[PDB]
Design a protein around this ligand. Structure first.
Ligand SMILES: Cc1ncc(COP(=O)(O)O)c(CN)c1O
Ligand SMILES: Cc1ncc(COP(=O)(O)O)c(CN)c1O
Ligand SMILES: *c1coc(C(=O)O)c1
Ligand SMILES: *c1coc(C(=O)O)c1
Lengths: 396, 396
């Protein structure tokens, strides 16, 4: 049965990680990482998370299965983060949330739900996007089409190209939007651009699918949800796939949510029953530990305060590294405008380096980025900034 | 998009759980439960698990993502449980294991892998089986066919009917076998029957898929794997979907494994790369907490000893309840042979009651079973046995 199976394309992350490991050079630097790292190069467990885990160890009396949609408090706190406390969508009971194994799990549950229960055949994704988006939608049998996004000349959002591309989208197609901290570019629509897109989506009959993996990493929890909320004000229906992997540092516990919104309670409940069916036939019910940590934190004033500060600390360290990177490149004689880095949001940006410059950085200087030139600014520290920037200047 | 979606068929578990909750009668008894319960009617966290969770709280320094296939030690311990320490399959590196979100996750990963990378179109499942088997395989686009299994007259394995049914299976079809503690019947093949099936499967070109959700609940860890090991001795290729939900009481942490076996290391590694691709496009990588508990326990002599005794305690309590049930039915004047209950394995058996007797038990006596007459013997206790049996006798 298996003798003729073709191997999956080589895993580019890992391999990049593998090459980094094998590199014997002192002063090697890994900007190809997916996760947040602090000033010491660690990805620690958040203190709020450790406190919540201690509480669960002390208080849990069973591991009895959660419902298909997971912990009710997790769903409620999730909807409040997304839509705001006192949102009409919440008051009108127009939203239902399933706790999922990570953002990826949320996207796949959305995809399976759409493939099996609707006429959706096609999902529109930005060029560029997280590479796994295509894999997830394709796995559910959905076609993926790309819309223009990145102006490589000006390192900004090519808003005209975006709108023009999306004119090819038919009514009933899904359009995927990154809620904030676009991956890989860090370029997000302004509120007015979000509002323009919200109106256009209503007019054209697109089903919006928001992917919200970085809430809090751009400007703040509420500000980062403005785009979503602009859409939610205008649409009867949408879906949100969210992730707590980065903003709680809960990567490996697989903590996310798929939130379904419809015109009214009757309709969302009926549709959600099929979303639960899609979950039941996939992983049955979701993993408790990580989501329980999230619910415990979000629902407790003390823990939530500690967590919000920890998130702020991450967001601020990222911003500081963006500023330090631009300053240091200027001071090391780059003689070229990198100011776009300060205005971009989250861990990721395109450096503007070519694939060959990236290869040269790895081979000659032991500086590792993704082949697209995407860099994780959280891989930068005050201590590694100078040699990193000297390496970059050398390949310009 | 959602206005015309048909609601999923009513969830029969839940609803049964809901009806039980709403029942105001004292003396109500729930035999429709899916989980293990102890003599006090609780599903506690195992002591070995609490000890391991304390160790993880003290020692974990990151929640950084696991690899796609999860914790290496978890994979190694899993393969040893399945195949035995020093197995040729292990020594020859013919097996690869992915840690998954539960047994269900393992089955779905198997299904997606098979649908996308092989000619498999059809999976053969026992009549009866766990109802979610059909849902999982169908979700991946695979047809499900049934093979005869249960002799309702003698409450035994209809081995002739089984072999005759499976003659319709074509070479390259998948045949699913419950490793031990068949769900819902508790009827397992003898070793000689397993050996007969192993030979037949080789001759007919079936790909065996073992579902092993109850290892340790029949006779013991090694004995319960005899059937699998008989197949593994004969086949170049097979797949095992295993679950630690019942035998570690880790239900809600979603702890299982999908183990792929091929003729040699080269072939299994190549095929496994596609299994990892199927995981990446589903939930990305698996939840750490539960699997880390399992690895911590299985790899430590002290914790593993505590856990093995806790598992033995569950297995023995189940057996005691089977014996007590048969004795008490005789003593309450059933005047009918229920001895088949003593010979069946695990939490579940068909009581032999009809759908209407089951309905009558719920309505008149507040005794709850599944409509098929399946009962969970772990819902029985010394204290509830007499009224339970008096209720059953009354509807005979
Ligand atoms: C845009 C985007 N969507 C979803 C995911 C997947 O998130 P998770 O690791 O929680 O599955 C990521 C990675 N955090 C991402 O960058
Ligand atoms: C035969 C069988 N297969 C798989 C499963 C699913 O296991 P899990 O709850 O770990 O997903 C079950 C339920 N334990 C089962 O009875
Ligand atoms: C978090 C995990 O992976 C990423 C990525 O960009 O690949 C973010
Ligand atoms: C464990 C969870 O569900 C079962 C079942 O038979 O439904 C076992």
């Amino acid at each position: 049965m298996f003798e003729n199976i073709t191997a999956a394309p080589a895993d580019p992350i890992l391999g990049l990680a593998d090459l980094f490991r094998a590199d014997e050079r002192p002063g090697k630097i890994n900007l190809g990482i997916g996760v947040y790292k602090d000033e010491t190069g660690k990805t620690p467990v958040l203190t709020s998370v450790k406190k919540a885990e201690q509480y669960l160890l002390e208080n849990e009396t069973t591991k009895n299965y959660l419902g298909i949609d997971g912990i009710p408090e997790f769903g409620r706190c999730t909807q409040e983060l997304l839509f705001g406390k006192g949102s009409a969508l919440i008051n009108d009971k127009r939203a239902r949330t399933a706790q999922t194994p990570g953002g990826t799990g949320a996207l796949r549950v959305a995809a399976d739900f759409l493939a099996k229960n609707t006429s959706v055949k096609r999902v529109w994704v930005s060029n560029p996007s997280w590479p796994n988006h295509k894999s997830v939608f394709n796995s559910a049998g959905l076609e993926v089409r790309e819309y223009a996004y990145y102006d490589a000349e000006n390192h900004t959002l090519d808003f005209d190209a975006l709108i023009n591309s999306l004119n090819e989208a038919q009514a009933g197609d899904v359009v995927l939007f990154h809620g904030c901290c676009h991956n890989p570019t860090g370029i997000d629509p302004t509120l007015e651009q979000w509002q323009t897109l919200a109106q256009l989506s209503v007019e054209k009959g697109w089903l919006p699918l928001f992917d919200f993996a970085y809430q809090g990493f751009a400007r703040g929890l509420e500000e980062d949800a403005e785009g979503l909320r602009a859409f939610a004000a205008m649409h009867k229906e949408l879906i949100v796939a969210s992730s707590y992997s980065k903003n709680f540092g809960l990567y490996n516990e697989r903590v996310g949510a798929c939130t379904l919104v419809a015109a009214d309670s009757e309709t969302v409940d009926r549709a959600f029953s099929q979303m639960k069916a899609a979950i039941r036939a996939n992983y049955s019910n979701p993993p408790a530990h990580g989501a329980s940590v999230v619910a415990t934190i979000l629902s407790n004033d003390a823990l939530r305060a500690i967590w919000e500060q920890e998130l702020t600390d991450m967001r601020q360290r990222i911003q500081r590294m963006r500023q330090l990177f631009v300053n240091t490149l200027q001071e090391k004689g780059a003689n070229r405008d990198f100011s776009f880095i300060i205005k971009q949001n989250g861990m990721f940006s395109f450096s503007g380096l070519t694939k060959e410059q990236v290869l040269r950085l790895r081979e000659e200087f032991g500086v590792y980025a993704v082949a697209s030139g995407r860099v994780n600014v959280a891989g930068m520290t005050p201590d590694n900034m100078a040699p990193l920037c000297e390496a970059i200047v050398a390949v310009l």
